[PDB]
Amino acid sequence: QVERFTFQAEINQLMSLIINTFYSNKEVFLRELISNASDALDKIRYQSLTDASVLESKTELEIKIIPDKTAKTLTLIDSGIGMTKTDMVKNLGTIARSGTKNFMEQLQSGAADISMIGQFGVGFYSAYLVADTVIVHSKNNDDEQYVWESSAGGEFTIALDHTEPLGRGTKIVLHMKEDQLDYLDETKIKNLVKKHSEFIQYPISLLTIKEKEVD
The resolution of the experimental structure, rounded to one decimal in Å, is 2.0
What are the binding residues?
A: 36, 78, 91, 124
Q: Is 100 helix (H, G, I), strand (E, B) or coil?
A: helix
For the sheet containing 131-139, what is the strand order? 2-6, 155-160, 146-150, 131-139, 169-176, 73-78, 63-68, 204-206
Cα 24 to Cα 13: distance, rounded to the nearest angstrom: 19
By CB atoms closer than 10 A (0-12, 13-18, 19+), residue 181 is: middle
36, 35, 28, 31: which is closest to 129 by C-alpha?
A: 28
What letter would DSSP give residue 162?
-
Compute the half-sphere exposure of residue 17: CA atoms within 13 Å on the CB side of its CA. Answer: 22
Domain covering 1-215 in this structure, CATH number = 3.30.565.10
Note the helical H segments in the chain.
Answer: 9-20, 28-48, 85-93, 98-108, 186-195
CB atoms within 10 A of CB 74: 26
Residues making up the chain, counted from first to last: 215
Do residues 113 and 20 make contact, with C-beta atoms less than 8 angstroms apart?
A: no
For residue 168, the one-letter residue type is R
Q: What is the dihedral of CA 102, 104, 107, 112, to 10 degrees?
A: 50
What are the binding residues for ATP?
A: 36, 78, 91, 124
What letter would DSSP give residue 7?
P
Dmax (CA) of the chain: 61
Q: Is 182 helix (H, G, I), strand (E, B) or coil?
A: helix
What letter would DSSP give residue 71?
T
